[PDB]
From a paper:
Curli proteins are produced via dedicated and tightly regulated cellular processes, and their fibrils mediate host cell adhesion and invasion, lead to immune system activation, and scaffold bacterial communities known as biofilms. The two key players in curli fibril formation are CsgA and CsgB, the major and minor curli subunits, respectively. CsgA, a 151-residue protein, consists of five imperfect sequence repeats (R1-R5), defined by regularly spaced serine (Ser), glutamine (Gln) and asparagine (Asn) residues. The first and the last repeats (R1 and R5) form amyloid fibrils in isolation and are critical to CsgA seeding and nucleation by CsgB, while the other repeats (R2-R4) contain 'gatekeeper' residues that temper the amyloidogenicity of CsgA.
However, while 45LNIYQY50 (R1), 47IYQYGG52 (R1), and 137VTQVGF142 (R5) formed unbranched and elongated amyloid-like fibrils, the 129TASNSS134 (R4-R5 loop) segment formed scarce and more amorphous structures. The 45LNIYQY50 (R1), 47IYQYGG52 (R1), and 137VTQVGF142 (R5) segments bound the amyloid indicator dye ThT and demonstrated dose-dependent amyloid fibrillation curves with short lag times. 45LNIYQY50 and 47IYQYGG52, which are overlapping segments from the R1 repeat, adopted very similar structures. Both segments, as well as 137VTQVGF142 (R5), adopted a classical amyloid steric zipper architecture, with two possible dry interfaces between paired β-sheets. The β-strands were oriented parallel to each other along the β-sheets. These three structures are class 1 steric zippers, as defined by Sawaya and Eisenberg according to the organization of the β-strands and β-sheets. In each of these dry interfaces, the chemical properties governing fibril stability, i.e., buried surface area and shape complementarity between sheets, resembled those of eukaryotic steric zipper structures. Specifically, the R1 45LNIYQY50 and 47IYQYGG52 segments and the R5 137VTQVGF142 segment formed fibrils that bound the amyloid indicator dye ThT and formed canonical amyloid class 1 steric zippers. These segments contain Gln49 or Gln139 (marked in bold in 45LNIYQY50, 47IYQYGG52, and 137VTQVGF142), which are critical for fibrillation and cannot be mutated to asparagine without interfering with curli assembly. The R1 segment 45LNIYQY50 and the R5 segment 137VTQVGF142 also induced fibrillation of Aβ1–40. In agreement with the hypothesis that the steric zipper segments serve as spines of CsgA fibrils, we found that the D-peptides also inhibited the fibrillation of the R1 45LNIYQY50 and R5 137VTQVGF142 spine segments in a dose-dependent manner.
Residue numbers in the entry:
A (entry chain B), B (entry chain A), C (entry chain A), D (entry chain A), E (entry chain A), F (entry chain B), ...: 1 to 6
Amino acid sequence: VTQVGF
Amino acid sequence: VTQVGF
Amino acid sequence: VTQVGF
Amino acid sequence: VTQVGF
Amino acid sequence: VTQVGF
Amino acid sequence: VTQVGF
Amino acid sequence: VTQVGF
Amino acid sequence: VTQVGF
Amino acid sequence: VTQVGF
Amino acid sequence: VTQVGF
Amino acid sequence: VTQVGF
Amino acid sequence: VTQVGF
Amino acid sequence: VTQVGF
Amino acid sequence: VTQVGF
Amino acid sequence: VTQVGF
Amino acid sequence: VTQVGF
Amino acid sequence: VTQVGF
Amino acid sequence: VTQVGF
């Protein structure tokens, strides 16, 4: 699980 | 941004 | 952006 | 954008 | 955009 | 399952 | 499951 | 940005 | 599960 | 930014 | 920024 | 589990 | 910044 | 578990 | 900054 | 568990 | 457990 | 357990 939020 | 991963 | 992954 | 994947 | 995939 | 939305 | 939303 | 991963 | 949102 | 991972 | 990891 | 938020 | 890790 | 928030 | 680790 | 917040 | 906050 | 806060 990899999550990138911006 | 809302992220839910499992 | 709403993301749900499983 | 709403994404649901399983 | 609404995406549901399973 | 690959989802791309923009 | 890969989700890209923007 | 809210991220929940497990 | 990879999630990218922006 | 709120992150919960387990 | 709130981070909880376990 | 990797979470990046900004 | 609040961090809880265990 | 790696969390980066800023 | 509040940090609790165990 | 690695947490970086700023 | 490594926590860096600033 | 390493904690750095500033």
